[PDB]
From a paper:
We also report on human neutralizing antibodies that target SD1, a generally understudied but highly conserved region of S next to RBD. To gain insight into the neutralization mechanism, we formed a complex between sd1.040 Fabs bound to a prefusion S-2P trimer and used cryo–electron microscopy (cryo-EM) for structure determination. The majority of sd1.040 contacts are mediated by CDRH2, CDRL1 and CDRL3 loops. The CDRH1 and CDRH3, which do not interact with RBD/SD1 in the cryo-EM protomer structure, are shown to directly contact the NTD in the simulations. These quaternary interactions are likely to stabilize the complex, which by surface plasmon resonance (SPR) displays ~20 times stronger binding affinity for S (KD 0.2 nM) than for SD1-RBD (KD 4.2 nM). The mechanism of neutralization by sd1.040 does not involve inhibition of receptor binding, since sd1.040, unlike C121 (4), failed to prevent ACE2 binding to S in ELISA. ACE2 attachment in this assay improved fp.006 binding to S, which was however blocked by treatment with sd1.040. Thus sd1.040 interferes with conformational changes downstream of ACE2 attachment. Instead, its function is likely linked to inhibition of conformational changes that expose the fusion loop upon engagement of ACE2.
The coronavirus (CoV) spike protein (S) is a trimeric glycoprotein of S1-S2 heterodimers that mediates binding to target cells and membrane fusion (1–3). Using coldspot-guided antibody discovery, a screening approach that focuses on portions of the virus spike glycoprotein that are both functionally relevant and averse to change, we identified human neutralizing antibodies to highly conserved viral epitopes. Through this strategy, we identified neutralizing antibodies to the fusion peptide, to the stem helix near the heptad repeat 2 region and to the subdomain 1, that are broadly cross-reactive and protective in vivo. One coldspot includes the S2’ cleavage site and a portion of the fusion peptide (FP, aa 814–838), which is substrate of the TMPRSS2 and Cathepsin proteases; a second one is at the stem helix that precedes the heptad repeat 2 region (HR2, aa 1142–1161); and three coldspots span sequences at the discontinuously encoded subdomain 1 (SD1).
Author numbering:
A (entry chain L): 1 to 27, 27A, 27B, 27C, 27D, 27E, 27F, 28 to 214
B (entry chain H): 1 to 52, 52A, 53 to 82, 82A, 82B, 82C, 83 to 100, 100A, ...
C (entry chain A): 321 to 591
Write the structure that this text describes.
């Protein structure tokens, strides 16, 4: 089979700038007697089947605007999007059709560049009704930050915890191009009564110091 | 015209079989090939077979040689993807595509809608909804946040809304996550002005169609 | 000089149900002969050839032995009752009452014909009329057609309007089985196996397994019934998804597609 490697894995581009994604191969995929490469560039949005975007590596189907191009020969190829708008955020794949493997690519997500912003942190003590179920969940939420990279560290009685927390991240918003993050910590009723203080710590580029939203049982 | 449509989603225990139909319409059914591809959740695309009408091969890669069986039908113009010996790593979405323009060509132009297949040992049950009490001393500015949390549901079509569509601005619903017991959890939050904390009512409602369960609850300030 | 030998056959271990067509009970008549299609299986013809209960086992295109070294795309099986004196009639290039009128074997039929006596199982006292043969037909039959229509005949210029009588006879009549007659009138079971080969992946093959493949050596190879000697190396050429083997000019096999992997290998004559 042919192993197709596509780089860079992810990129962020502002509005109205260039953007290039490169898709390499493992064996020379041209063909004498015809001189025709053998490649295809696709595009997938969430909750949508991939739709063909470029074929023959130098032609486009009907309906695709002129902002999308395609050039290259031999082993390495390129896309070179011309102008970036708000509706061009998707995942791109490259596929070859000269061998039985039908190998594709890896996927290169696109984002929109913007100025750095600071997050907002909010903690939620567990509800009284939840105590009857024997499970305690604590959630501290991060809102309206950029970039995605943010470090969340849970502390109970000034002790580090691991292996009992889950994280979830929302898709980039279409209004202000920002994110929200959720960090849920779960534990049993048995170990709730022998601890005193719980908190979560946030590390981010836009914050000079880790913001401490301390919480203690009994609202003391 | 020139379109393919498939069946609905399926959830089954390991060891069972799966049948998927790809009904075609618009073109001459016996002049083009047809391939099947699959997509794991969060991974890249794959390739798992090929078949042509008017009789022909059903070729597979090495890892799908003795497992998948791809039949053919005429008049009704349907294809099948009998799959056997399910495992836990098969939960995916399946697409059926055709070749187009003959020759040696792929051009997977008219993809189908794809069907979702889940393989698990859990059992269907209804979700549980709880509120998240705010902080009465949190006055960072003119805005605060509330939320309601859903727990222990399977399978995972779940629609959550706030105040029966009254509240739309400032809502956030996060994707579901997997637990150790094979049951999903999810949470929803809403940011509202803090000055009107004790003015209007707030209710979050959840619908789960598999279990045909509708649950309304109302998050309210704490003491 | 070659050093080793390599063979490669598909990853399949499903025994072919050859007993269903042979060991069943209710078999159709001659002019309504049944047809069964066989594919995607492995079969052993040695036990079929060595049966010792086979009155006539005659066949063409392949030798009775060595048949476990060939692969085909499809198999077709037919079965019918034929009276004892007319077993010879099921053969290429024969003119007769039943072959020309009910079922004619094509001249280029590359396959096998089996016939054996079953008088102890189908002969009935007083007359077995269950099995019937078409006696009266208007036109000759091209190879491999089935006629079911039983419309009345008009053998003269005066139409009978569907009433039997003068110049109008029923094409269908009973055999009249009786175990008290001679050898010639006795019945015989007849089964025809047909074979075909096209440019498509093989489905039904013979016994014996495969071995690991080697490269960069002069080796004797057998891929799906294709034998050769040479050096196997890696090449690059366009191969359509279904085409199996490609050849260079002057009818020399240059590249072969390896089963179980869909890899493409190049053959170079070792010198
Ligand atoms: C041929 O088919 C067999 C049956 O599925 C494949 O499985 C191998 O045989 C047994 C399982 O029955 C194990 O001991 C081997 O480990 C199996 N192989 C693997 C990779 O698990 C066998 O692999 C097939 N031969 C091939 C693919 O070359």
């Amino acid at each position: 089979d042919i192993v197709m490697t596509q780089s860079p894995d992810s990129l962020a581009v502002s509005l109205g700038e260039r953007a290039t994604i490169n898709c390499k191969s493992s064996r020379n995929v041209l063909y004498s007697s015809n001189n025709k490469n053998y490649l295809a560039w696709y595009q997938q949005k969430p909750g949508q089947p991939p739709k063909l975007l470029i074929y023959w590596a130098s032609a486009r189907e009907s309906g695709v605007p002129d902002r999308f191009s395609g050039s290259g020969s031999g082993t390495d190829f390129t896309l070179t999007i011309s102008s970036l708008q708000a509706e061009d955020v998707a995942v791109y794949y490259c596929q070859q059709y000269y061998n039985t493997p039908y190998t594709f690519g890896q996927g290169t997500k696109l984002e929109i560049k913007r100025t750095v912003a600071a997050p907002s942190v909010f903690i939620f003590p567990p509800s009284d009704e939840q105590l009857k179920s024997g499970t305690a969940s604590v959630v501290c939420l991060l809102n309206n930050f950029y970039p995605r990279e943010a470090k969340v560290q849970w502390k109970v009685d000034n002790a580090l915890q691991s292996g009992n927390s889950q994280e979830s991240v929302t898709e980039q918003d279409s209004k202000d191009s920002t994110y929200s993050l959720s960090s849920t910590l779960t534990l049993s009723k048995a170990d709730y009564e022998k601890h005193k203080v719980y908190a979560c710590e946030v590390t981010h580029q836009g914050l000079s110091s880790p913001v401490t939203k301390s919480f203690n049982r009994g609202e003391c | 015209q020139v379109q393919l449509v498939q069946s609905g989603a399926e959830v089954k225990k390991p060891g069972a079989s799966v049948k998927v139909s790809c009904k075609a319409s618009g073109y001459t059914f016996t002049s083009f090939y047809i391939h099947w591809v699959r997509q794991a959740p969060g991974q890249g695309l794959e390739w798992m077979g090929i078949i042509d009408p008017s009789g022909g091969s059903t070729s597979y890669p090495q890892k799908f040689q003795g497992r998948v069986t791809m039949t053919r039908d005429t008049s009704t113009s349907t294809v099948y993807m009998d799959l056997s010996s399910l495992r836990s790593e098969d939960t995916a979405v399946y697409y059926c595509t055709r070749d187009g323009s003959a020759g040696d060509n792929s051009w997977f132009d008219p993809w189908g809608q794809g069907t979702l297949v889940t393989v698990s040992s859990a059992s269907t049950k209804g979700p549980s909804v709880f509120p998240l009490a705010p902080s009465s001393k949190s006055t960072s500015g003119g805005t605060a946040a509330l939320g309601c949390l859903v727990k222990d549901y399977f399978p995972e079509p779940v629609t959550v809304s706030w105040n029966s569509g009254a509240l739309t601005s400032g809502v956030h619903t996060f994707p579901a996550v997997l637990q150790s017991s094979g049951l999903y959890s999810l949470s929803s939050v809403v940011t509202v002005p803090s000055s009107s904390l004790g003015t209007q009512t707030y209710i979050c409602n959840v619908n789960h169609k598999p279990s045909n369960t509708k649950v309304d609850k109302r998050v309210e300030p704490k003491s | 000089q070659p050093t080793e030998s390599i063979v490669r056959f598909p990853n399949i271990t499903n025994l072919c149900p050859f007993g269903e067509v042979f060991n069943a009970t209710r078999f159709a008549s001659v002019y309504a002969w049944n047809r069964k299609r066989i594919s995607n299986c492995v079969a052993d013809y040695s036990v079929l050839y060595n049966s010792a209960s086979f009155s006539t086992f005659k066949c063409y295109g392949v030798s009775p032995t060595k048949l476990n070294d060939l692969c085909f795309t499809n198999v077709y099986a037919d079965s019918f009752v034929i009276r004892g004196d007319e077993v010879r009639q099921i053969a290429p290039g024969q003119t007769g009452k039943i072959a020309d009128y009910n079922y004619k074997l094509p001249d280029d039929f590359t396959g096998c014909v089996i016939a054996w006596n079953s008088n102890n199982l189908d002969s009935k006292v007083g007359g077995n009329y269950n099995y019937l043969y078409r006696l009266f037909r208007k036109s000759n039959l091209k190879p491999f057609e089935r006629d079911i229509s039983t419309e009345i005949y008009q053998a003269g210029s005066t139409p009978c309007n569907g009433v039997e009588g003068f110049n109008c006879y029923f094409p269908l009549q009973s055999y009249g089985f009786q175990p008290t007659n001679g050898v010639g009138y006795q019945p015989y079971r007849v089964v025809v196996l047909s074979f075909e080969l096209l440019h498509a992946p093989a489905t039904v093959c013979g016994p014996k397994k495969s071995t690991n493949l080697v490269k960069n050596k002069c080796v004797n190879f057998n891929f799906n019934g294709l034998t050769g000697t040479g050096v196997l190396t890696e090449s690059n050429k366009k191969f359509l998804p279904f085409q199996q083997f490609g050849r260079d000019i002057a009818d020399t096999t240059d590249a072969v597609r390896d089963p179980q992997t869909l890899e493409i290998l190049d053959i170079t004559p070792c010198s």
